[PDB]
Amino acid sequence: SYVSLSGLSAAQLDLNTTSNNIANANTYGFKESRAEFADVYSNSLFTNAKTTPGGGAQASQVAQQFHEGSSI
Amino acid sequence: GQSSQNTELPSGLMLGAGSKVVATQKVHTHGNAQTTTNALDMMVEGDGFFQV
């Protein structure tokens, strides 16, 4: 359930970031953002990796893509 | 036991003294396997004993 709840948060972060870009479709000088995620796996000395699944999805960074925009 | 000269006791009057438990047999048939995630617990699949 925690891995699924990690996926919902990761999918919600992407949706929030995309909504922010669309909301700022008109503001001058705005630079869009891209959400980047990373996996999770942590196995103890007492845990047998061969029988273990992963830890979910971890958000790595929300960038700040700085490519040139159109000019009005 | 011999009766007469040719006839022998087919069954004798023998009275039992009861019953008792003479031994306790440890039946070393293999048990089932529990699937765990711990890496420090092992199992002998077949004959063998761990040493301590």
Q: How was this structure determined?
A: cryo-EM
A42 contact B CB<8A: no
Given B35, B37, B40, which is nearest A52 (Cβ)? Answer: B37
Quote helix, strand, coil % in chain B, to nearest 5: 0, 5, 95
**A18 burial level (CB within 10 Å; 0-12, 13-18, 19+):** middle
Whether the CA torsion B27, B33, B38, B41 is positive or negative: it is: positive
CA–CA dist A35, A61 (Å, integer): 6
The amino acid at residue A65 is Q
Q: How far is A43 from chain B (nearest CA, A)?
A: 11
Task: Enter the resolution in angstroms.
Answer: 3.0
Contact between residue A30 and residue A24 where contact means Cβ atoms under 8 Å apart: yes
Q: Which of A45, A51, A52 has the most B C-beta neighbours within 10 Å, making it the best mutation to test the interface with B?
A: A51
